[PDB]
Design a protein around this motif. Structure first.
Motif, mmCIF file in Angstrom:
data_model
loop_
_atom_site.group_PDB
_atom_site.id
_atom_site.type_symbol
_atom_site.label_atom_id
_atom_site.label_comp_id
_atom_site.label_asym_id
_atom_site.label_seq_id
_atom_site.Cartn_x
_atom_site.Cartn_y
_atom_site.Cartn_z
ATOM 1 N N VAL A 129 0.969 -1.126 -0.027
ATOM 2 C CA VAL A 129 -0.032 0.109 0.021
ATOM 3 C C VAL A 129 0.746 1.277 -0.049
ATOM 4 C CG1 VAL A 129 -1.505 1.475 1.492
ATOM 5 C CG2 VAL A 129 -1.998 -1.086 0.931
ATOM 6 N N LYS A 168 1.449 4.104 -3.089
ATOM 7 C CA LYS A 168 1.297 5.524 -3.031
ATOM 8 C C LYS A 168 2.315 6.440 -3.574
ATOM 9 C CE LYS A 168 -0.694 6.405 1.347
ATOM 10 N NZ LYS A 168 -1.053 6.117 2.721
ATOM 11 N N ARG A 200 -9.907 6.683 -5.504
ATOM 12 C CA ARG A 200 -9.703 5.674 -4.434
ATOM 13 C C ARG A 200 -10.225 4.492 -4.715
ATOM 14 N NH1 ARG A 200 -6.003 7.245 -1.070
ATOM 15 N NH2 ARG A 200 -7.062 8.922 -0.225
ATOM 16 N N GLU A 201 -11.343 4.576 -5.286
ATOM 17 C CA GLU A 201 -12.036 3.073 -5.957
ATOM 18 C C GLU A 201 -11.148 2.085 -6.686
ATOM 19 O OE1 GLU A 201 -14.740 2.104 -4.514
ATOM 20 O OE2 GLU A 201 -15.917 0.827 -6.015
ATOM 21 N N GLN A 215 -7.778 2.691 -6.893
ATOM 22 C CA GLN A 215 -6.560 2.346 -5.874
ATOM 23 C C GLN A 215 -6.671 0.868 -5.439
ATOM 24 O OE1 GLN A 215 -5.505 5.594 -3.532
ATOM 25 N NE2 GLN A 215 -5.990 6.903 -5.122
ATOM 26 N N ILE A 216 -8.165 0.769 -4.650
ATOM 27 C CA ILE A 216 -8.533 -0.406 -3.924
ATOM 28 C C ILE A 216 -8.715 -1.462 -4.846
ATOM 29 C CG2 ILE A 216 -10.246 -1.251 -2.666
ATOM 30 C CD1 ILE A 216 -10.710 1.620 -1.416
ATOM 31 N N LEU A 224 -7.638 -7.782 7.725
ATOM 32 C CA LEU A 224 -7.206 -7.352 6.632
ATOM 33 C C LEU A 224 -7.139 -8.244 5.397
ATOM 34 C CD1 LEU A 224 -6.160 -4.877 4.822
ATOM 35 C CD2 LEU A 224 -3.863 -5.308 5.794
ATOM 36 N N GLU A 226 -10.708 -9.143 4.361
ATOM 37 C CA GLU A 226 -11.091 -7.900 3.682
ATOM 38 C C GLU A 226 -10.739 -7.953 2.067
ATOM 39 O OE1 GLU A 226 -11.058 -4.251 5.216
ATOM 40 O OE2 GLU A 226 -9.636 -3.723 3.656
ATOM 41 N N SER A 231 -20.170 -0.163 -3.436
ATOM 42 C CA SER A 231 -18.674 0.256 -4.057
ATOM 43 C C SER A 231 -17.879 -0.763 -3.475
ATOM 44 C CB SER A 231 -18.310 1.721 -3.636
ATOM 45 O OG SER A 231 -18.394 1.860 -2.147
ATOM 46 N N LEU A 232 -16.768 -0.869 -3.966
ATOM 47 C CA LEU A 232 -15.451 -1.681 -3.263
ATOM 48 C C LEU A 232 -15.224 -0.911 -2.173
ATOM 49 C CD1 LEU A 232 -12.957 -2.506 -6.118
ATOM 50 C CD2 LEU A 232 -14.916 -4.146 -5.176
ATOM 51 N N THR A 233 -15.054 0.536 -1.998
ATOM 52 C CA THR A 233 -14.565 0.935 -1.009
ATOM 53 C C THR A 233 -15.140 1.112 0.451
ATOM 54 O OG1 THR A 233 -13.735 3.115 -2.335
ATOM 55 C CG2 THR A 233 -13.757 3.355 0.041
ATOM 56 N N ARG A 250 -16.592 -1.761 1.469
ATOM 57 C CA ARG A 250 -16.252 -3.146 1.672
ATOM 58 C C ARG A 250 -14.768 -3.403 1.998
ATOM 59 N NH1 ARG A 250 -16.853 -5.089 -2.622
ATOM 60 N NH2 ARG A 250 -18.402 -3.734 -3.678
ATOM 61 N N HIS A 251 -13.897 -2.428 1.919
ATOM 62 C CA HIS A 251 -12.602 -2.190 2.103
ATOM 63 C C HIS A 251 -12.146 -1.348 3.156
ATOM 64 C CE1 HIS A 251 -13.057 -4.893 -1.385
ATOM 65 N NE2 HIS A 251 -12.130 -5.616 -1.044
ATOM 66 N N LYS A 252 -12.781 -1.277 4.531
ATOM 67 C CA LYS A 252 -12.242 -0.274 4.997
ATOM 68 C C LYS A 252 -11.044 -0.133 5.604
ATOM 69 C CE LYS A 252 -17.231 0.492 6.776
ATOM 70 N NZ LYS A 252 -17.874 1.488 7.635
ATOM 71 N N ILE A 253 -10.475 -1.467 6.238
ATOM 72 C CA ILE A 253 -8.842 -1.452 6.540
ATOM 73 C C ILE A 253 -8.022 -0.790 5.541
ATOM 74 C CG2 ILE A 253 -6.859 -2.535 7.831
ATOM 75 C CD1 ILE A 253 -9.575 -4.613 8.519
ATOM 76 N N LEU A 254 -8.251 -1.497 4.430
ATOM 77 C CA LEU A 254 -7.450 -0.880 3.223
ATOM 78 C C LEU A 254 -7.440 0.621 2.827
ATOM 79 C CD1 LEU A 254 -5.394 -1.759 1.159
ATOM 80 C CD2 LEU A 254 -7.251 -2.875 -0.378
ATOM 81 N N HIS A 255 -8.975 0.964 2.941
ATOM 82 C CA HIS A 255 -9.081 2.432 2.481
ATOM 83 C C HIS A 255 -8.669 3.335 3.767
ATOM 84 C CE1 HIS A 255 -12.353 5.943 2.944
ATOM 85 N NE2 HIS A 255 -11.288 6.141 2.042
ATOM 86 N N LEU A 304 -5.556 2.574 5.379
ATOM 87 C CA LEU A 304 -4.325 2.556 5.147
ATOM 88 C C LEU A 304 -3.941 3.353 3.857
ATOM 89 C CD1 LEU A 304 -3.337 -1.445 5.200
ATOM 90 C CD2 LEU A 304 -2.800 0.535 7.029
ATOM 91 N N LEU A 305 -4.660 3.682 2.705
ATOM 92 C CA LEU A 305 -4.868 4.541 1.885
ATOM 93 C C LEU A 305 -4.884 6.059 2.121
ATOM 94 C CD1 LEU A 305 -6.101 2.279 -1.222
ATOM 95 C CD2 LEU A 305 -3.811 3.376 -1.276
ATOM 96 N N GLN A 306 -5.546 6.443 2.945
ATOM 97 C CA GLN A 306 -5.767 7.946 3.544
ATOM 98 C C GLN A 306 -4.777 8.065 4.514
ATOM 99 O OE1 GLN A 306 -9.761 7.016 5.394
ATOM 100 N NE2 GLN A 306 -10.678 8.705 4.111
ATOM 101 N N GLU A 307 -4.101 6.975 5.434
ATOM 102 C CA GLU A 307 -2.871 7.415 6.282
ATOM 103 C C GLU A 307 -3.265 7.228 7.689
ATOM 104 O OE1 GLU A 307 -0.116 10.687 5.815
ATOM 105 O OE2 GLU A 307 1.403 9.116 5.959
#
Ligand SMILES: CCCc1c(OCCCN(C)C(=O)Nc2ccc(C(=O)O)cc2)ccc2c(C(F)(F)F)noc12
Ligand SMILES: CCCc1c(OCCCN(C)C(=O)Nc2ccc(C(=O)O)cc2)ccc2c(C(F)(F)F)noc12
Lengths: 238, 15, 235, 15
Positions: free
Chosen positions: C59, C63, C73-74, C76-77, C228, C231, D1-3, D5-10, D12-15
């Motif tokens: 991850v 970045k 962001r969609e 990215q995931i 993690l 998910e 959305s995928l977002t 359903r992927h809270k922890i990954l989201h 990590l991406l936000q920081e």
């Protein structure tokens, strides 16, 4: 990348082998059960029709592989290992070759085109159909000729990493000669686009994923108690 | 062997 | 023909990967150590926590990839969810020890096929991981090649649920071109090295699928993945 | 959305 006489002759033979393989299957393709309104009968005939297209395709794939330099020097065991797993990939490649962007259809038989709904009606699930047509869309954008398809098919067949390959060294060594041949050929066909060569190669990556989705398709047939004809069952059923 | 389990494919290869 | 811009971009990737390795040092230090039901659990916890830290590095590396944060962001995931495992396999093959046929995860510690099975993975996945690692080691990739292959794997326009396919593809190709130009300096007398590297992306797709069967076997066994990994990998 | 359903990954991406 300097196209040599040896490579040039080889590419031409593949292209002629492919055309020769197709005329050999003209009669067998003539007796495919015809494509037929809302009955169990009708959905068996469409399924029969599609699977019989696939049977003849495997015949052609086998015939073409026999003409591939080095293929017949492999043990018959390795030959079967390579074909069992590449057949679906070669078929998907041939499918994308016959794609019609305008109507998003596939022309198998000459005066007859098949769209996404026809695939569904032929027994295929949408989770497989949609990626076939997406892959076919993307491949059409690359506008590959006979020579590039012939070589993409050969590269796909000579994959050292298939299940149950004994002489992985030699299979890989053989793949490399078709990779170099393609690299050199794409330098004549696309001399101002050094990306075209790797883009072609990258489609083999997408093909592996389509193969996986195809395995799920074959598994669903089991649950539909829809039985594959003997050749397809032998190569595809677990 | 794979060969014994793929009799049609094998026959197509033999000719 | 390697240009200034490509040379600079490749070096930042290589610097980025080492920087990412640094930021997760502490997290790798706090991971359950390698060691009954207690021992079996602890091994699984050991492996899976290595995977979690690894997902955090991937991850963080993404970045840093030029163009990655400009994708939605969609997307990215979308990209990270399916490439994570392929990136993990690439990192596994980097740490392959040919003589023992083991993978060195933590620095005084090597793991072989038997250890993998004890950590809770099945033989149908383990043997392919080790065969791929073997084939990968013969290529002798360096930091720069590994970093580019990882970028190319992440910028795969054909993943499920990618919206901006054009842009993802466009980005991937800058990494493909850079890898080509780079491999022409590193292997100036072998024009197969470039395509051989790209063909490993083909093998990784199959390994990704063999991994999906592994995640499925864990359902049957009721061995749950931590949050993690669940998910990203569970259906 | 995928977002969603992927809270922890989201995160990590936000920081
Ligand atoms: C579509 C994916 C492959 C595929 C099939 O292909 C049928 C199409 C095969 N094919 C490539 C072909 O026929 N070519 C072709 C060439 C020349 C002429 C000509 O000159 O007339 C006509 C036709 C059919 C059935 C199945 C199944 C299942 F079995 F699970 F259903 N799984 O995958 C399948
Ligand atoms: C191998 C397949 C990936 C993988 C795992 O990886 C464990 C290892 C993860 N990894 C690649 C890694 O840690 N790299 C790494 C880098 C740097 C350092 C360092 O600098 O010290 C140390 C280590 C762990 C569990 C699973 C599972 C399941 F859970 F489904 F079973 N499926 O796939 C898995």
């Amino acid at each position: 990348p300097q196209l040599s006489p040896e490579q040039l002759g080889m590419i031409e033979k593949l292209v002629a082998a492919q055309q020769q393989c197709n005329r050999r299957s003209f009669s067998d393709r003539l007796r495919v059960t015809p494509w037929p309104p809302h009955s169990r009968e009708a959905r068996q005939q469409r399924f029969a029709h599609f699977t019989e297209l696939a049977i003849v395709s495997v015949q052609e794939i086998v015939d073409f592989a026999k003409q591939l330099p080095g293929f017949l020097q492999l043990s018959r065991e390795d030959q079967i290992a390579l074909l069992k797993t590449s057949a679906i990939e070669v078929m998907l490649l041939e499918t994308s070759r016959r794609y019609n962007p305008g109507s998003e259809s596939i022309t198998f038989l000459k005066d007859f085109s098949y769209n996404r709904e026809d695939f569904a009606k032929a027994g295929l699930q949408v989770e497989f159909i949609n990626p076939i047509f997406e892959f076919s869309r993307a491949m059409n954008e690359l506008q590959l000729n006979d020579a590039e398809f012939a070589l993409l098919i050969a590269i796909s067949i000579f994959s050292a990493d298939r299940p149950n390959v004994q002489d992985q060294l030699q299979v890989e060594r053989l793949q490399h000669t078709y990779v170099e041949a393609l690299h050199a050929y794409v330098s004549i066909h696309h001399p101002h686009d050094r990306l075209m060569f790797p883009r072609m190669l990258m489609k083999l990556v997408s093909l592996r994923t389509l193969s996986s989705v195809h395995s799920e398709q074959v598994f669903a047939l089991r649950l539909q108690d829809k039985k594959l004809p003997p050749l397809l069952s032998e190569i595809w059923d677990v | 062997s794979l060969t014994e389990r793929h009799k049609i494919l094998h026959r197509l290869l033999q000719e």
